[PDB]
């Protein structure tokens, strides 16, 4: 009586398709840009290490 | 007679994969990626 | 009669290697690597 | 009754192919750039 | 992170 979907054994299987998948190929704009803007971490570290040009500035003249 | 994940009563649920579009996202069309960077010129304007 | 990794009931699983594309990645086409650096010019523009 | 995939003995074996492998040769863009941007460590130490 | 250009400013001249 209960009834329902059964998935005997184990192999690659699909069911309840479309919706999520379709929505993914459409945009996912929020997380897409979110992760994309978090990519700057590369440029961030580059700056963090480019700071080393400060070498010239060690000639402090605190008179 | 029965084995698996039987579920009943009320609203929504899901159990499988159905990664249709998701798979299509991984298999991104090169032309789609091109247009992406090509269009960036507009974003740059909003920056400048 | 039987030896190995028997598994049943529900969704997904995997047990082997199936490193098809992965092996192909290691055996990267030289021409593919070339186009990579050759195309970088676009990235440089976004930098400049 | 249980049924399933058996892998008697031990040698090089493939099964459940495509998907992962194919996806790898396609891009793996996130980790590709991630590891690539972590490569600057060389230029980092050089500056250091 | 762009703040890092402050590098030049490390040449403090607190006389």
Author numbering:
A (entry chain B): 717 to 779
B (entry chain A), C (entry chain A), D (entry chain B): 717 to 764
E (entry chain B): 765 to 779
Please give me the paper's original passages concerning this structure.
Vaults are large barrel-shaped particles found in the cytoplasm in all mammalian cells, which may function in innate immunity. Ninety-six copies of major vault protein (MVP; 95.8 kDa) form the thin, hollow vault shell with dimensions reported as 725 × 410 × 410 Å3. The shell is made up of 96 identical protein chains, each of 873 amino acid residues, folded into 14 domains. Each chain forms an elongated stave of half the vault, as well as the cap of the barrel-like shell.
